[PDB]
Design a protein around this ligand. Structure first.
Ligand code: ADP
Ligand code: MG
Ligand code: MG
Length: 290
């Protein structure tokens, strides 16, 4: 509901880009003294078409209705006269995403399992609100402090109508295919269980400290090959249907890899829900903590 006046917004730096969104760091200082809050402002590029504009409206509408300790905090909106739409104002998390933080900070196993438990808590809340995230990846998991994680980026999020188990989307170039379950790839159907598959991929990213050489696109493309014409998604669907999976990260405990593999069941109903994962991850974190 809050309205931020463009008048008092001072750009500090960009945090994320590019086609078709941009996240920037601003100081919102109405007193003009410097005591003003630091905010992360997400803007829709003025060049964006109707499809991305109706989607952006949905992203703001969804984030506005969500309230959870593991979901990025919505602060309000700013009128972007130049766009012309709304700029999404949210809390700024200094440590950034796990994708940017982990390659530079060796975090212990216990802490990574805590982040994974918190991701499941935030996701179970999201699923109880009858929404699917559709872009669950380490790049979209923001770190508030060494012990606290927050899910962001609701750009692909959708409301799943009551009584329905899935939502159908179309063939898109920006689809994060390397984080997607086979039902999404082959039938274009996104179930609550499809987000669980993406969590298994996110859990794999965390256990690899988001190392680029071990990332899901890197590993799947080494399996698929780069001279496949328009067939990368087809070869991906085929390798997953044959039971091939991302490997066990170095130092990942066997039980944790088995949990990962269970999130990667080909049959969507054989996967645990986020509600089932919470006590499991609480127990595993407790085992590994010291
Ligand atoms: N609240 C925030 N605080 C700090 N960095 C953020 C915040 N929101 C986003 N970012 C950074 O900007 C990147 C892009 O933001 P995101 O919402 O995921 O946009 P996109 O839809 O283009 O992927 C994130 O991966 C992260 O690096
Ligand atoms: Mg993102
Ligand atoms: Mg996004």
């Amino acid at each position: 509901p809050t309205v931020f006046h463009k008048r008092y917004l001072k750009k500090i730096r960009d945090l994320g880009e590019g086609h078709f969104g941009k996240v920037s760091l601003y100081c919102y200082d109405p007193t003009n003294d410097g005591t003003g809050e630091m905010v992360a402002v997400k803007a829709l590029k003025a060049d964006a078409g109707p499809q991305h504009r109706s989607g952006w409206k949905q992203e703001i509408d969804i984030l506005r209705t969500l309230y959870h300790e593991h979901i990025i905090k919505y602060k309000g909106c700013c009128e972007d006269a130049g766009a012309a739409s709304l700029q999404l104002v949210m809390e700024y998390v200094p440590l950034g995403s796990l994708r940017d933080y982990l390659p530079r900070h060796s975090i212990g196993l216990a802490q990574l399992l805590l982040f994974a438990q918190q991701i499941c808590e935030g996701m179970a809340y999201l699923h109880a609100q009858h929404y699917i995230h559709r872009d669950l990846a380490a790049r979209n998991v923001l770190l508030d402090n060494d012990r606290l994680v927050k899910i962001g980026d609701f750009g692909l999020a959708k409301a799943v109508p009551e009584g329905h188990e899935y939502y159908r989307v179309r063939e898109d170039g920006d689809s994060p295919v390397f984080w997607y379950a086979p039902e999404c790839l082959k039938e274009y159907k996104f179930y609550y269980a499809s987000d669980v598959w993406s969590f298994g991929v996110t859990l794999y990213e965390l256990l690899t400290h988001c190392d680029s050489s071990q990332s899901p696109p890197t590993k799947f493309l080494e399996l698929i090959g780069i001279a496949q014409g328009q067939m990368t998604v087809l070869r991906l669907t085929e390798l997953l249907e044959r039971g091939e999976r991302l490997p066990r990260p170095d130092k990942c405990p066997a039980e944790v890899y088995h949990l990962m593999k269970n999130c990667w069941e080909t049959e969507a109903s054989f996967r645990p829900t986020f509600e089932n994962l919470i006590p499991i991850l609480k127990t595993v974190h407790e085992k590994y903590r010291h």
